């Protein structure tokens, strides 16, 4: 796709701190950009829609290449259309925003300049942020995560993408998403199937795969930490059901691991650690700090701070594993006790280390789940299981929760606020901000 300018594009600025081992930190100035799927896609020379509702223009977009030549992405009104704002080091995302139309959620990337994404090398480093999840009920996911996207949004590889990172192109993740409207500088109209339960979305014949580090998938009820390896580390197109992932008939038949090696304290048995109010170790009515450390062995460590009190990730015992470090003994034990082979099939933490050794893009989002109602995060899943099935219970939400139309109707003013991002060598991010 190209870019059009009927609507100006001004990325909301966002600062973060880069910390050094010597004990100081220095402020960095970036900004956020909304993913291309949320934008208006129209003809390059008029206001005619290329995509409207959950269908494509059959005349502008008769095939993937012609559509990309004929169509452009336009600018975003971040606050009034998308419910997105920033202030200093803080980013807020509203759930339902009513303007001339209804918008649900957003997926945002941290930039380095107005035309390039910021890349982070996680290995050997730690990432800290503060979050307020108090306004996130069952069924919503305020996510902070990394993906192995290109810094230019794909422009150097895909000449027919001239919009780039400035317009939020180039997304990929471990679900090999097929809901993207543009992949590899071409549209995804070929094979498009409109969603029966979502007036705005569909599934195309291609998907976009890459490694994904889910630092934080959470609401006020549940939270999880999940690495997802892929056999190709960075962005790569996939073909139809060969994609696997959420958007294919076969979830487990692709190059990425769409389930991951999740660490969810509630799921592992500590049902008292995280939740609303003073009966939980971390009170999700109040802001909390989340620190995630990527040691060079490939294991992942985690601690939290709230009201100046520090808590390591709670200990868990699962099969022959015992501890609080997410390491390949944990992930192997999790497959043996809870089931699955996807994570190990795709190379486990060894393969995942290839992603964290390289650059990844920071993603912050708020979404509801039109495929599984977020039950995999915060409820019992699959819903016919009970607490007697190991790992089935992920959180205390009802198995009836999270129907998109219902939570959009009941909780439109839900929101997430991410703030005070700090990044640097392990042990450095708790030192004074510059
Ligand atoms: O929040 C960011 C997303 C980026 O797309 N992170 C991964 C998320 O897509 C994982 O979703 C799932 C993760 C998952 C893990 C184990 C079992 C089932 C599921 C599942 C089932 C249906 C729909 C989704 C899932
Ligand atoms: C849950 O984890 C917290 C933090 O490690 C710990 O203080 C608490 O005792 C744990 N509770 C249970 C029931 O495991
Ligand atoms: Co193809
Ligand atoms: Co270690």
CA 40, distance to chain mean position in Å, is 21
Give the C-alpha separation, 34 to 73, whole Å. Answer: 11
| Tokens 């009104």 belong to residue | 77
88 Cα to the center of ligand 3, angstroms: 43
308 Cα to the center of ligand 2, angstroms: 17
386 Cα to the center of ligand 3, angstroms: 41
Owning domain of residue 355: 2-434
Structure tokens at 237: 């197109």
Give the C-alpha separation, 345 to 213, whole Å. Answer: 17
| Tokens 């790992």 belong to residue | 391
| Tokens 């909780």 belong to residue | 411
Give the C-alpha separation, 60 to 332, whole Å. Answer: 50
300 Cα to the center of ligand 4, angstroms: 7
Ligand closest in space to the Cα of 275: 2
Residue 41 near residue 68 (C-beta atoms within 8 A): no
Give the C-alpha separation, 419 to 377, whole Å. Answer: 23
Structure tokens at 124: 């050997």
> What does DSSP assign to residue 268?
T
Parallel, antiparallel or unpaired: strands 55-56 and 51-52: antiparallel
392 Cα to the center of ligand 3, angstroms: 36
Question: Hey, which residues does 422 pair with through a beta bridge?
Answer: 17, 128
Residue 231 near residue 351 (C-beta atoms within 8 A): yes
What residues have CB less than 8 Å from 355, skipping those under 6 apart? 148, 210, 211, 213, 229, 230, 233
What residues have CB less than 8 Å from 87, skipping those under 6 apart? none
Structure tokens at 138: 């069952």
Using alpha carbons, list the distances in angstroms from residue 168 to 14, 33, 74, 163, 284: 16, 6, 11, 8, 31
Ligand 1 pocket list (CB less than 6 A) = 141, 143, 145, 173, 175, 214, 217, 246, 259, 371-372, 376
Buried residues in 165-197 as b, exposed as e (16+ CB within 10 A): bbbbbbbbbbbbbbbbbbbbbbbbbbebeeeee
Closest ligand 2 atom to the C-alpha of 314? Answer: 5
User: Resolution in A, one decimal?
Assistant: 1.0
What residues have CB less than 8 Å from 74, skipping those under 6 apart? 3, 4, 5, 6, 7, 9, 39, 40, 41, 42
Helix axes 348-357, 328-338, angle to 10 degrees: 130
Q: Is 389 in the pocket of ligand 2 (CB under 6 A)?
A: no
Give the C-alpha separation, 174 to 236, whole Å. Answer: 11
CA 235-241-244 angle, to 5 degrees, is 55
CA 82-84-86 angle, to 5 degrees, is 160
> What does DSSP assign to residue 282?
E
Residue 401 near residue 369 (C-beta atoms within 8 A): no
Ligand closest in space to the Cα of 304: 2
**Within 10 A of 348 (CB to CB), how many other CB atoms are there?**
19
> Of all helices (H) and strands (E), which one includes residue 366?
strand 359-368
Structure tokens at 255: 């190059």
Q: What is the DSSP string of 221-263?
A: S-EEEEEE-BSS-S-EEEEGGGG-STTSS-SSSSSB-SS---B
> What does DSSP assign to residue 273?
S
Ligand closest in space to the Cα of 314: 2
Q: What is the DSSP string of 159-221?
A: TT--S-GGGT----BTT--S--SEETTEE--TT-EE-TT-TT-EE-SEEEE--EEEEEEE-SS
Give the C-alpha separation, 291 to 426, whole Å. Answer: 10
CATH number, domain of 282, equals 2.70.100.10
235: closest CA among 182, 183, 298? 183
Which of 106, 176, 180, 246 to mutate for ligand 1's pocket (most ligand atoms within 8 Å of CB)? Answer: 246
Give the C-alpha separation, 235 to 38, whole Å. Answer: 20
State residue 49 phi and psi, 5-degree precision.
-70, 135
209 Cα to the center of ligand 4, angstroms: 29
> What does DSSP assign to residue 59?
T
Residue 33 near residue 43 (C-beta atoms within 8 A): no
Q: Is 303 in the pocket of ligand 2 (CB under 6 A)?
A: no
> What does DSSP assign to residue 433?
P
Buried residues in 353-381 as b, exposed as e (16+ CB within 10 A): bbbbbbbbbbbbbbbbbbeebbbbbbbbb
| Tokens 């730690």 belong to residue | 126
Number of structural domains (the chain) is 1
Structure tokens at 275: 């939740």
> What does DSSP assign to residue 12?
P
Active site residues: 212, 217
Residue 135 near residue 294 (C-beta atoms within 8 A): no
**370, 374, 376, 380: CA torsion to nearest 10:** -110
Q: Is 314 in the pocket of ligand 2 (CB under 6 A)?
A: yes
Residue 414 near residue 94 (C-beta atoms within 8 A): yes
> Of all helices (H) and strands (E), which one includes residue 329?
helix 328-338
CA 206, distance to chain mean position in Å, is 19
Residue 149 near residue 186 (C-beta atoms within 8 A): no
Atom 14 in ligand 2: residue holding the nearest Cα: 270
Which of 272, 312, 318 to mutate for ligand 2's pocket (most ligand atoms within 8 Å of CB)? Answer: 272
Question: Hey, which residues does 406 pair with through a beta bridge?
Answer: none
Give the C-alpha separation, 346 to 261, whole Å. Answer: 11
Give the C-alpha separation, 241 to 207, whole Å. Answer: 9
Q: Is 44 in the pocket of ligand 2 (CB under 6 A)?
A: no
Q: Is 296 in the pocket of ligand 2 (CB under 6 A)?
A: no
Q: Is 272 in the pocket of ligand 2 (CB under 6 A)?
A: yes
| Tokens 């190990």 belong to residue | 344
Give the C-alpha separation, 362 to 70, whole Å. Answer: 30
On the 0-12 / 13-18 / 19+ scale of CB atoms within 10 A, 291 is buried
């Amino acid at each position: 796709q190209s870019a059009c300018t009927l609507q100006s594009e001004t990325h909301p600025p966002l600062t973060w701190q880069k910390c050094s081992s010597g004990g100081t930190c220095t402020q960095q100035t970036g900004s956020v950009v909304i993913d291309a799927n949320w934008r208006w896609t129209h003809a390059t020379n008029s206001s005619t829609n290329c995509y409207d509702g959950n269908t494509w223009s059959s005349t502008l977009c008769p095939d993937n290449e012609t559509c990309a030549k004929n169509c452009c992405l336009d600018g975003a009104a971040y606050a009034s259309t998308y419910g997105v704002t920033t202030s200093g080091n803080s980013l807020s995302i509203g759930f339902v925003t009513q303007s001339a139309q209804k918008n649900v959620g957003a997926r945002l990337y941290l930039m380095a300049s107005d035309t390039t994404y910021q890349e982070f090398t996680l290995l050997g480093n730690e990432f800290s942020f503060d979050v307020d999840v108090s306004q996130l009920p069952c069924g919503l996911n305020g996510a902070l995560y990394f993906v192995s996207m290109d810094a230019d949004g794909g422009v150097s590889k895909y000449p027919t993408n001239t919009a780039g990172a400035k317009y939020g192109t180039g997304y990929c993740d471990s679900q090999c998403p097929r809901d993207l409207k543009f992949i590899n500088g071409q549209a995804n109209v070929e094979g498009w199937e409109p969603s029966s339960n979502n007036a705005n979305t569909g599934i195309g014949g291609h998907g976009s795969c890459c490694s994904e580090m889910d630092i934080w998938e959470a609401n006020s009820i549940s939270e999880a930490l999940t690495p997802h390896p892929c056999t190709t580390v960075g962005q790569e197109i996939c073909e139809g059901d060969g994609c696997g992932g959420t958007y294919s008939d076969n979830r487990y038949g692709g190059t990425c691991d769409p389930d991951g090696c999740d660490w969810n304290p509630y799921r592992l048995g500590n049902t008292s650690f995280y939740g609303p109010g003073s009966s939980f170790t971390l009170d999700t009515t109040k802001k909390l700090t989340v620190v995630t450390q990527f040691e060079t062995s490939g294991a992942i460590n985690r601690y939290y701070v709230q009201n100046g009190v520090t808590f390591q990730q709670p200990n868990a015992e699962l099969g022959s594993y015992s501890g609080n470090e997410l390491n390949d003994d944990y992930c192997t034990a999790e497959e043996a006790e809870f089931g699955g082979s996807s994570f190990s099939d795709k190379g486990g933490l060894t393969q995942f280390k290839k992603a964290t050794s390289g650059g990844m893009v920071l993603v912050m989002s708020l979404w509801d789940d039109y495929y599984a109602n977020m039950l995999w995060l915060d409820s019992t899943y699959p819903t016919n299981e009970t607490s007697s099935t190991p790992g089935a219970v992920r959180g205390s939400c009802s198995t009836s929760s999270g129907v998109p139309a219902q939570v959009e109707s009941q909780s439109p003013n839900a929101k997430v606020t991410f703030s005070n991002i700090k990044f640097g060598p392990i042990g450095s991010t708790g030192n004074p901000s510059g």
